Structures are given as C-alpha cells and as structure tokens.
C-alpha cells in the first residue's frame, strides 16, 4: 500500500433540500405524513413537495425553455411525531 | 426461524439502550467490540438482532479502510457518522454504525510489512469520536451546534494488533464470542427446523463434527440441495426448462437424513484435507 | 461533584491567565502540552476545568491533520485560530483552542512508515503561530491588522515522536501527568461520593487494584446498571424498545440505586480484569 | 533594553543598505539566509533590528507554501513581493520581505516522503526573483513597467535539504549563527538587566548550564511569576476569573518584583531540565 | 454452431432455475458475478446459452452508466428491472437482465482502483434490489402491485470491495471461469469447424500457445487475406491503389477462398505473439 497527497487542475463547465432557509415572502405548509411500508422518510417528503407544486420528474423540450429552480416547492424540515410509528 | 443466542442478543441490546438513555453520573463506552474465531456468526447474528428491534444500520466494510489517498479512510468515518446522527433526528428511531472487520485496516501484525499514515489516522479518528460523540466536525467552517450521539459496533478477528489507547475499559466494551455446545445445538437446530429432525438427532450431528464453524452446517445444506436441483435440470432437459418452471412437478425433495448428513460432511472434510 | 486534582487545575489556570495578562519584559509560551499514560484523565480533567471557569473551547481532532488535498490541514489550523480570536472580541470572555491527540497527527511511529508532506506542514504551521500569535494571514490579499492572542492546549500519549524545534522551552510549556495515591483516593472518592463509602473502604479499592488507570474504576459503575436495564428491555419487549426510549410520549424510566458495597465492587472489578486478560 | 549581538546587527544592516544603494560594477545578492541550531535567536533578533531601524516587514509562513491548486503557492510569492514593493513608493522608507522557516516548506526530508509539484515550482520562483528583481510579472496582462527592489531575509534550520541552484554565493548571502561565551553573557545580561545581578553572578549562570539555547534562560523568568499569579486567581475566584481579565473595564492588576537570587535561579533551571528529561526517556 | 463449455452452462442453469423455482425454506442469491481475464468469452458464452434455452435477454452496457454525460444509473437500473419483469407475463418465458464491465470500459484508468460517485450509485441501487426484489419503485407513479423477481448476471475482470457485504450475506454468488485444455479444444474446434481441420491439428494449435486468451485464436482467422492483398497491390501498383478502389466504378476485387493449413496458422500465430510481446 502507498498513499499520496495531491494538487489538481480543473477543466470546469432536486426536491428535498434541508439546507434551504425560508423567506419572509413564502407560503409555508405543515403536513402529517403517513407512508406505505417499505418507503423512506426523506423519499416520502420529497414526493409530497413535488406533487403539490409542479411535479415534472422527466424533462421535456418545453421544460428547458424555462427556469426550473424559480417555480419549485421544496421540503426544508422533517420532524417525527412522538409515540408513533412511521 | 433462525435462532439467536440469548447471550448475544442481551449484550447488543443493553449496549445500544444504555447509549440512548441518559442516566446521570454514569459514563458509558460508545464502542462494543465483538471478537473471536472466523465464521462463528459475528456479523450474521447482528443482522438478526437489528431486524428484531427494527433499527437502521450504517455499514462500513473492512476492505475500505486502506485507500491510495492519505486521510481518505479517516474522512469517510466522520462523514458516515454525521449521516447516521441525522437519521436519529429525522426518522426518530435508533440508528447504529457498524464497522465490520477492523483488524484488516487498522491492524499491525509483523514488522516485515510497510504501513502508511492511514493506519495511524484510522486509530486516531475513532478515539476522538469516542471522546466527543456530540462534537464531530465536517471539513470547512467550524460549527458549535451539537449532534445526536450514535453507538458504534466493531467486529474483528483480533484486537491485540491495534493501537493501545483505542482498547481500554473506558472507551470500548469487549466481548469474546465462542459458541458452546448449547449454542451450537440451538443454531444448528434453527437451520434444520424446517426439514423435520428430532432434538436427539440434532445433538448427534454436532457430536460427529465438533471442530467445525457455524458456516460449515449452513454450507452443508446448500451442497445437499445443489445435487437435487442439478439432476432436475438434466431430467427435464435444457430445451424446455422454461416451460415447466414459469407455470415443481417430478422434483424429489432433498435427502435430509441424519445418516447421510454425516456421510456428506465427511466428504467435505476429505476435500478440505486434499488442499491441506 | 467530580474531584479535579489541584496540580492539574493550577497548571492549566496559570497558563491561560498569563497569556491574557500583559506583564512587560516577560515572554510566555503559547502552547501547553500535557502527556502521560492512557486513561489517567488528561482530556477529562481539562473538560471539567474549562466548565468550572466557564470558557469556550474550539476542538480540532488529531485524526483530521492529514487530507487528500495538499496544505488543507495547514489551512485548517490557520482558520480555526482566527475563528477563536473573533470570539474573544465579540463575546468578551476567555477562549481556548484544543488539539486532542497530537501524537497520532503530526507524529512518526517508526522509521519505515511512508509519510506525506502534510505532516511536514502541520509542524511548521504551529511553529509560526507560536512565534507570531498576532499575525496569521488568511490566504489571498495581505492585511497588516492585528488579532487577539489565543492560547493552545495539546494532549498526547508521547511527544518523543514529534518535530524537535516544535518542542522547546520558548515555544511549548511541557507538563507530565501521573496521579499519585492521594490523587487516586481523591478522584475515585469523587466518583463514589453519592454512593456513600467510608474512607477506609475507598483506600482498600485502590490497594486491591494498584496498577490501574482512572478509567477502570469509572467502568465498574457502568456494569452495575446492566441488570436493571436488561429487565426494562424485557418488560417493554424487544419488538418496540426503540419507540419507548427515543420517541415516546412518556416520562423517561427511573432506576433505583443498586446496592454498593466493597465486596460487590471487587467482584465486578475482577470480572473486568478477566475480560482484559481474555484478549491479552 | 534588549541586547542585539553586534555581529547579527552588522550583518543585517550591511545587507539591507547595500540593496537600496546603487554602486556601479558591484553585483549584490538579493536573498540573505540565516541558519543554525534551534532557540539561538535567529528569528527574534531580526525583529529587534527592524524595530531599532524602524522598517516595515512582511511575513510569510513556511506552512503557507502548499495549496490544493497547482502553482498557487508560486503566485503567493510573487504577490507578496509586489505588495512590499508598493510600500516603498507610498511611505518612503525601507521595506523587507521575510520568509520565516523556509526549510519546512520547500525542504525534502528524505526519499520516503512523497512531495508535490509545488515544492519544485517554489524553489524555481525565488530563483527568477533573485535574477530579475525589477521585472516581476503577475499572471494576466504583460506590462513593461519597472518596480522597486526588495531584499529578502530567510530563516531555516538546515539549508542542505533544498534545491541546490537556489543556494549559491551569487544568488544568496549565507550567514551561520552560533553564539559564543561573550555573546551569551551579553544576551543573558540584557534579559536580567532590570533584576540586578553582578557580573560574576551572570558568568556563573552560563557556566552552570553551558549547553543551552537562549530560549532556556527566558523560560526561567516565566516560572518565577507563577506564585503571584496563582494567588491572584484564588483571590478573584475561578468562577469569575474570565470576566476579570479579558473584559478589562477597571484597571489590570500589578505584581511586585519577585526575589532574584542565583540560588533560586539554579533551582528553577534544574526544574526545567527535569521536565525536558521526562519527555526524552 | 459455437461450442459451449458444460461447466459454464451448468452455473447459468442452476442460478436461473433456482430463482424462478418456489421452494420453501430455501434462500437463493439474486445476483451472480463472473470474473476472468479479458477475451475469455464470458459475454459470448452468456449470449449463446440464452439462445439454446430460448430465454429473453436484456443487455445493459457498462459504458452506459459509467459516462458522466449519460443520465442517472440509479434511475436506469430500476427502469430496466421493471421492463424485464413485464416480459415474463407478456412473453410467458424466463427473462434475465445482465450487465457487462460494471467497473470497466468507462475510459478511466483505475478500473475500480478508485471509486467514483457513479460507482457508489450502482452499489446502492443493486443492494436495494437484492433485499426487496419483489417490489421496486420509481420516482413517481408508485404501484402497490408486486413484480415477478428477476435474476441478474454481472461480468467483469474483478469485483470491488464495496460488494463484499453482498457476498458475505450470500446474496451474490461469484463464479471464476478459467478455460482448460478440453474447453480450448471445444472453442477452437467450433471456430475452425467450417474450415475443416482434423482433431490432431486442433490439438497442435492449443499446444503451440498453451497460455493464451480465447480471443487470440479467433483473431487468427482475420489475417488470411493479407498475402492476397499484398500481392494484389503489386499488380495494380502503389501509384494508383487508392483511386480504383475508393471511388471508381469497376468490378469489385475478387479473392479465392484461402487454403487452410496448420503451417499458415503457426506462422500467423508467431507474428501476433511477437507484437504483443513488444507492446507489453
Ligand atoms: N445464527 C445463524 N443462523 C443460521 N446461519 C448462520 C448463523 N450464524 C452464522 N450462520 C451462517 O454462517 C456464516 C457466519 O459467518 P458471518 O456472518 O460472516 O460472521 P463471521 O464469519 O463469524 O465474522 P468474521 O469473519 O469473524 S469478521 C453466515 O454467512 C451464515 O451463512
Ligand atoms: N477527575 C476525574 N473524575 C472522575 N472520573 C475521571 C476523572 N478523570 C478521569 N476520569 C475517568 O477516566 C476516563 C479518562 O479518560 P481520558 O480523559 O481520555 O484520560 P487520558 O489520559 O486523556 O486518556 P488518553 O491518554 O487520551 S487515552 C474518563 O472517561 C473518566 O470516566
Ligand atoms: N538577543 C536576545 N536578547 C534577549 N532575548 C533573546 C535574544 N535572542 C533570543 N532571545 C529569547 O530566546 C527566544 C529564542 O527564540 P528564536 O529567536 O525563535 O530562536 P531561533 O533559533 O530563531 O528559533 P528558530 O530558528 O525559528 S527554530 C526568543 O523568543 C527570546 O525570548
Ligand atoms: N465459445 C466461443 N466460441 C467462439 N468464439 C468465442 C467463444 N467465446 C469467446 N469467443 C470470442 O471472444 C470474443 C469476445 O470476448 P468476450 O465474450 O467479450 O470475452 P470477455 O467478456 O471475457 O472479455 C469474440 O471474438 C468471440 O468470437
Ligand atoms: Mg484522552
Ligand atoms: Mg525561531
């Protein structure tokens, strides 16, 4: 085994985001969510944020003629309900 | 249908629970270390235990702790720990980080081998997490915001060849797993529970082959089943094997007899001796 | 109700104060390095000392002083020093940087291990910070505008495997820790203070296991609580133990104080020695 | 009140003066390098001399000579040179760029350690500057415009482990530092000047601990103040010692000069030695 | 008319059969992985076996999920798995999905030496399918109805360490396929069956190159027209070889069927050996 440290050169050139901070001019909503067995919590929350806003999982030629981040609802916080499963 | 040893389950349960309870005045070890002989079922019995309690597992493989990049094995541990801490916060249930086969990565056998910085760093990282479970940093800007405490389960073959401060009573709770006769009887009795063998018959099988690991018995079942399936494919024929499977007629059930389970096991030992 | 050893408290107190105070004609070391043996309570007695005084701690892990990027651990120390310096100006109280376990960071075990350049730079970065506590340059444009002086506390098992110019009188104040019998009695007595044992009984516990670190005695107490916890898991049931502990609308369980006697403690102590011998 | 050794003060003055002066015919080396053993007063005596002459310094750390982007530490050397060249034009005084501890940045310890491309380039970058101090080009647009000459002072522990063409008579003026008995007596005398010791007593202190750095003697003075400070911490109390020092709203406390005797100093010296020996074994 | 090795066929039979079979108390590995040297014919054997059995095959390129500008492997593997499951109902026959060069043909030098973001995704996707084969979910239009389980085959040079969990779990089976003398005779015999070579002749070819890849022997057939082309060039002449062939309306060049002898094959074999030797 031989490990090395490096310096490098660079060539250069979507619904659940917990990093986002809510704005003062935003509509906020609280949902009590119950998923089906075998579905993750973060997957279920991303599905609700998508289906209540724009949907659009597959990109079409019409979708590329507009901004995608501008008109999009996003989930920013998940909190568990005490004494309850899923 | 699989038998978990009551000793094994109680050691795991009490370790995880005590980490999650906040009993005042008591300091608890964050790492539980299971060690013993190879193929005794250290990993397998954990997976049964975690399924019973329904608790999420974050795995790190032992063949990942030595990379061609310096610090890359150390950075992964911190990254995976922070991911698991959030799952406790979000999913609102117990989550556990399990590092399997640590002996290969952080180990130090003979002096005839050439080691790197990574051996030094992997030992260093695990020490600091065990000291400050609430204060683990991601590279970049420092944040003084506390995170959820996550317990660590560590599997190995030997801990003698490991940095001395990482093995101390205050930092790691040690558990030596050597399955006894009563354990073996239960486990073997769990493998062949579906087949239909009496208690006395199960006892005899263990007595016949006492110097064997748990894997051996489970590997024996596969050998019995493979012969039967191979013959079925030949009898039906390759040309029309799909027609009589999609929609099993004329398929003799496997032998599964005490008399034969000895015979077949002797053949396996003879094959092992051939290489030896 | 933890006992902090007077020597350990005095040595740490004077080092921090003497940096923040200004006496003309006196030059003071920036780094304090505490070394000894495993489980004697270097890290732990520091934490009690920082909480008693009520001072902010910035923590750097020893297993973070090497990265796949070159000069990135060198950048890290220079960044964390500035960050701590700002907290003095804003909050208006003493702040301390702590690098726990330096030995395995910038240290060289044998003369056969392949090392990188990051090790070489981490030694040098701390050298320059200890020389000039006031002028630390964030990468990019230069600015000649002083920042506050911040003390650094360093823990290690061995300093013998470290760059030689970094360890010297003018750069690092050295302190070797090894608790005596009177220290042991005091600290172990502090652990079992709420339990209620006579002085003679405390002496006997130290005498029975004389060649033991402090961690050993604390580890005794963990083992005693097992029976109660095991019973609780059965009563609730293995199927839904997670729900009760982590996320439940009920008051967290209460455990009655187990019987603490010297005889029972020695029994448990011998059980821990047996477990250690199993690996040995 | 501190004593700068006349050898060290002359070697610094002559080098910095000669760079700013323009004598026709005489070629002068840009880089000055000072090397030797640890704790002998290489770094500290430079800072004193610059304070006595009243000249502006620009510090570059050794640990700042490596970055995750290739050829980026090369740029830093250039940019810090251009900046210091600007300060001459604006202020109208002598200015100096100092790269403290060069050995640990661009030095090759052994063949065991893997280095990067940056260690190569950094040695190269200084070689161009030492050849053409007037023409230093920052990457971007080429501009044919002269800049002022800035001398470079360099500290190090060992120059052996460093690219050989960077170390030659023509390109660097070399100065090895090792203080003698007279130098020791002078410096140690200056440290304890206010304390009040006889000449014979100062001689004895050097004789007791002959194989010792200058930092060893300075470390003694810190140890003597301990008792007064310890007592101050108790009187205030541990609970509020932080808000009684950092946020100085009233007046900082004062300490009377402790008893300074040769007998007490020797005792203190043995105690420092004891701590050094503890690490070794 | 190409020969298939009995061992290779057996390993495929048992895996496919057992997954489709519904025997209680029995656990079966979902994923089978085959590792060997390059040009061993692992891909060629798989395609042949399926034709004899008549079972439908879905092929996914290794470079199709390795390329940064391809799409999303996680979304792709899921989509291919569902589509294959639909075939069983509509087609009424067994359907298998296989992947070639999972860690290769990307263009990258490492070949699984260093992991990528894309490498992680395949591991993640595969592990989810192996645990819950009966139910597989897309981003939208979640269906409650279960899908028929589908066997997966994977071929490569070697398997990464990331897959070690699956193998220990026994969810993945690894088959190492290496050719033998008997296997060589079959494969070599099948290639040259149309040419017409004696059994003794076929044995000599394998004996000439005992330690050779399967691909080499196949490649020998190609260099039979070389003598004819070289001789043809001379009659036409170097001045105007291009013009007549490239863009001219004339009778296309005609070549008599090359004579097949053992001597010609040995001479050709030596030349390819020499070239490969010099390059490596
Ligand atoms: N309790 C069990 N019930 C049924 N089968 C078991 C049981 N325990 C082990 N086995 C079988 O035997 C194998 C045991 O090996 P592992 O699960 O890999 O643990 P391990 O080999 O003891 O851990 P290592 O190699 O020392 S780090 C498993 O793959 C199972 O097939
Ligand atoms: N003063 C104390 N009072 C009560 N318990 C203590 C005290 N000091 C140490 N301990 C216990 O002993 C353990 C000592 O751990 P550490 O602080 O890591 O000792 P250490 O010397 O820093 O260990 P190394 O060298 O980093 S391994 C702690 O987890 C405490 O439980
Ligand atoms: N000339 C002096 N007069 C009074 N005190 C001095 C004198 N020289 C050194 N000292 C003291 O001794 C210490 C020596 O530190 P340095 O000058 O950094 O030694 P050094 O040889 O330059 O270290 P390097 O080269 O960076 S490893 C100084 O911090 C002062 O406290
Ligand atoms: N049984 C066989 N009969 C004929 N040609 C074969 C056979 N096995 C492999 N080949 C040859 O191997 C080549 C393709 O190799 P491939 O199947 O991709 O091997 P691998 O996957 O081991 O690299 C083709 O030239 C093909 O003709
Ligand atoms: Mg510690
Ligand atoms: Mg110095």
From C129, C154, C179, the end of a domain falls on: C179
SS3 state of residue D35: strand
Q: Are B21 and B149 in contact (CB under 8 A)?
A: no
Q: What is the largest CA-CA distance in chain E?
A: 77
In this complex, the chains that touch C, judged by 3 or more CB pairs closer than 8 A, are A, B, D
Q: Which run of H or of E encompasses D39?
A: none
Pairwise CA distance, residues C117 & C71, whole Å = 8
C8 and C75 assigned to the same domain: yes
E19 and E71 assigned to the same domain: yes
Pairwise CA distance, residues B58 & B54, whole Å = 13
Q: What is the largest CA-CA distance in chain C?
A: 70
| Chain-centroid distance, C-alpha D183 | 18
Question: Do C249 and A83 lie within an 8 Å CB cutoff?
Answer: yes
Pairwise CA distance, residues D216 & E129, whole Å = 68
Q: Give the closest residue to C229 by CA, choosing from D125, B14, A48, B203.
A: B14
Question: Which atom of ligand 3 is found nearest the CA of C168?
Answer: 27
Quote the DSSP letter at residue D238.
Answer: G
* Burial of E108 per CB tally in 10 Å (0-12, 13-18, 19+): middle
From E138, E157, E179, the end of a domain falls on: E179
C77 and C118 assigned to the same domain: yes
Which residues are registered as beta bridge partners of B153?
B32, B98
Angle between helices E6-20 and E42-53 in degrees, nearest 10: 60
Residues near D216 by Cβ (< 8 Å), separated by ≥ 6?
A: C169, C170, D39, D209, D269, D272
Contact residues, chain B, for C230 at CB < 8 Å: 10, 13-14
Phi/psi of residue C238, nearest 5 degrees: -65, -25
- Cα separation of the two ends of chain D: 39
Question: Which atom of ligand 2 is found nearest the CA of C42?
Answer: 22
Residues near C78 by Cβ (< 8 Å), separated by ≥ 6?
A: C125, C129, C136, C137, C138, D63, D64
Residue D229 exposure: Cα atoms within 13 Å on the Cβ side: 20
* Residues placed in the known binding site of B: 36-43
Which approach determined this entry?
cryo-EM
Place of tokens 């300091």: B27
In terms of DSSP bridges, do strands C95-100 and C152-156 run parallel, antiparallel, or are they unpaired?
parallel
The residue among A2, A3, A5 with the most chain C CBs within 10 A of its CB, best to mutate, is A5
B159 and B201 assigned to the same domain: no
B89 and B103 assigned to the same domain: yes
Q: Are E12 and E133 in contact (CB under 8 A)?
A: no
As for how many domains chain B has, the answer is: 2
Helix ranges (H only) for chain A are 41-51
Q: Which run of H or of E encompasses D264?
A: helix D262-280
Measure CB to CB from residue A82 to each of C66, C116, C249 and give the nearest one: C249
| Chain-centroid distance, C-alpha E24 | 34
* Residue B190 domain boundaries: 180-276
D158 and D193 assigned to the same domain: no
Following DSSP, what letter does each residue of chain E receive, concatenated? -----HHHHHHHHHHHHHHHS--TT----SEEEEE--TTS-HHHHHHHHHHHHT-EEEEE-GGGTTSTTS--HHHHHHHHHHHHHHHHHHH-S-EEEEEE-TTSSSS-SSSSSS--HHHHHHHHHHHHHHH-SS----SSS---S------EEEEES---GGGHHHHHHTSEEEEE----HHHHHHHHHHHTTTT---HHHHHHHHHHSSS--HHHHHHGGGTTSHHHHHHHHHHH-GGGSHHHHHS--SPPP--PPPP--HHHHHHHHHHHHHHHHHH-
Q: Give the closest residue to C55 by CA, choosing from D252, D239, B144.
A: D239
Q: Tokens in use for D65?
A: 């000579």
Residues near C265 by Cβ (< 8 Å), separated by ≥ 6?
A: C205, C220
E75 CB within 8 Å of a chain B CB: no
Q: Are D71 and D122 in contact (CB under 8 A)?
A: no
Q: Tokens in use for E38?
A: 């390059």
C188 and C156 assigned to the same domain: no
Pairwise CA distance, residues E42 & E38, whole Å = 9
Pairwise CA distance, residues D133 & D151, whole Å = 9
D115 and D6 assigned to the same domain: yes
Q: What sign has the CA pseudo-torsion C80, C85, C86, C88?
A: positive
Pairwise CA distance, residues D273 & E230, whole Å = 89
User: Does the CB atom of residue B170 touch ligand 2 within 6 A?
Assistant: yes
Torsion of CA B143, B144, B147, B149, to 10 degrees: 130
Q: What is the largest CA-CA distance in chain D?
A: 70
Instruction: Quote the minimal CA–CA distance from B83 to chain A in Å.
Output: 13
B157 and B213 assigned to the same domain: no
Pairwise CA distance, residues D103 & D160, whole Å = 9
Measure CB to CB from residue C142 to each of D80, D239, D272 and give the nearest one: D80
From D128, D147, D179, the end of a domain falls on: D179
Q: Does chain E touch chain D (at least 3 C-beta pairs within 8 Å)?
A: no
Indicate which residue's Cα is closest to atom 24 of ligand 3. Answer: D38
* Burial of C3 per CB tally in 10 Å (0-12, 13-18, 19+): middle
In terms of DSSP bridges, do strands B152-156 and B95-99 run parallel, antiparallel, or are they unpaired?
parallel
Residues near B38 by Cβ (< 8 Å), separated by ≥ 6?
A: B157, B213
Radius of gyration of chain A (CA): 19
Give residues 172 to 231 of D whose Cβ lies within 8 Å of C.
194, 213-216, 218-219, 221-222, 225-226, 229-230
Pairwise CA distance, residues B37 & D190, whole Å = 69
Q: Which residues of D42-71 are buried (b: 16+ CB within 10 A; e: fewer)?
A: bbbbbbbbbeeeeeebbbbbbbbbbbbebb
Pairwise CA distance, residues D65 & D74, whole Å = 8
Torsion of CA C209, C211, C213, C216, to 10 degrees: -30
Pairwise CA distance, residues C114 & C117, whole Å = 10
Residues near D224 by Cβ (< 8 Å), separated by ≥ 6?
A: D258, D260, D264, D268
Pairwise CA distance, residues C208 & C190, whole Å = 18
Q: Where are the beta strands (DSSP E) in B24-165?
A: 31-36, 56-60, 95-99, 152-156
Torsion of CA E21, E25, E26, E27, to 10 degrees: 120
Q: Are B96 and B151 in contact (CB under 8 A)?
A: yes
Indicate which residue's Cα is closest to atom 13 of ligand 1. Answer: B215
Q: What sign has the CA pseudo-torsion B59, B62, B67, B71?
A: positive
**Cα-to-centroid distance, D70 and ligand 6 (Å):** 29
Residues near D196 by Cβ (< 8 Å), separated by ≥ 6?
A: D260
Q: Tokens in use for D247?
A: 């946020």
Instruction: Quote the minimal CA–CA distance from C229 to chain D in Å.
Output: 38
3 state SS for B139-173:
CCCCCCCCCCCCCEEEEECCCCCCCHHHCCCCCEE
Question: Which atom of ligand 4 is found nearest the CA of E155?
Answer: 21
User: Does the CB atom of residue B101 touch ligand 1 within 6 A?
Assistant: yes
Following DSSP, what letter does each residue of D181-220 receive, concatenated? HHHHHHHHHHHTTTT---HHHHHHHHHHS-S--HHHHHHH
B154 and B225 assigned to the same domain: no
B151 and B190 assigned to the same domain: no
C146 and C189 assigned to the same domain: no
Q: Any long-range contacts for A78-82 (C-beta under 8 Å, 24+ apart)?
A: A78/A18, A78/A41, A78/A42, A78/A45, A78/B90, A80/B90, A80/B91, A80/B92, A80/C247, A81/A32, A81/B92, A82/C247, A82/C248, A82/C249
- Resolution at which this structure was determined, Å: 2.9
Phi/psi of residue C129, nearest 5 degrees: -65, -40
Q: In the β-sheet with B152-156, what is the strand arrangement from edge to edge?
A: B56-60, B95-99, B152-156, B31-36, B172-177
Q: Give the closest residue to C76 by CA, choosing from C16, C151, C139, C18.
A: C139
Q: What sign has the CA pseudo-torsion E16, E20, E22, E26?
A: positive
């Amino acid at each position: 085994s031989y490990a090395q440290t490096k310096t490098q050169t660079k060539s250069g050139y979507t619904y659940y985001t917990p990093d986002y901070t809510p704005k003062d001019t935003d509509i906020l909503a609280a949902f009590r969510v119950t998923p089906q067995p075998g579905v993750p919590f973060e997957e279920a929350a991303a599905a609700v944020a998508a289906e209540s806003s724009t949907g659009t999982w597959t990109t079409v030629w019409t979708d590329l003629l507009t901004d995608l981040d501008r008109y999009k609802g996003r989930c920013y916080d998940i909190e568990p309900v005490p004494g309850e499963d899923n | 249908s699989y038998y978990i040893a009551p000793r094994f389950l109680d050691k795991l349960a009490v370790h995880i629970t005590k980490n999650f309870l906040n009993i005042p005045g008591v300091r608890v070890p964050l790492i539980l270390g299971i060690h013993g002989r190879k193929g005794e079922g250290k990993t397998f019995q954990c997976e049964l235990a975690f399924e019973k309690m329904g608790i999420e597992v974050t795995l790190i493989s032992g063949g990942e702790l030595e990379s061609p990049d310096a610090g890359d094995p150390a950075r992964l541990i911190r990254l995976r720990y922070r991911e698991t801490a959030e799952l406790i916060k979000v999913r609102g249930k117990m989550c556990v980080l399990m590092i399997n086969d640590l002996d290969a990565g952080a180990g130090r056998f003979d002096e005839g081998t050439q080691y790197t910085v990574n051996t030094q760093l992997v030992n260093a990282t695990l020490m600091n997490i065990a000291d400050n479970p609430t204060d683990v940093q991601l590279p970049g800007s420092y944040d003084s915001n506390p995170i959820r405490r996550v317990p660590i389960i560590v599997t190995g073959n030997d801990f003698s060849t490991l940095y001395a401060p990482l093995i101390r009573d205050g930092r790691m709770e040690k558990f030596y797993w050597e399955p006894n006769r009563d354990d073996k009887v239960g486990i073997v009795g769990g493998i062949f529970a579906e087949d239909g063998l009496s208690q006395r018959e199960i006892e005899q099988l263990v007595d016949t082959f006492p110097k064997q690991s748990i894997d051996f018995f489970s590997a024996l079942r596969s050998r019995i089943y493979d012969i039967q399936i191979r013959d079925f494919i030949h009898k039906v024929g390759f040309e029309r094997i799909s027609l009589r499977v999609v929609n099993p007629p004329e398929f003799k059930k496997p032998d599964f007899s005490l008399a034969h389970l000895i015979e077949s096991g002797n053949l396996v030992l003879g094959e092992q001796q051939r290489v030896d």
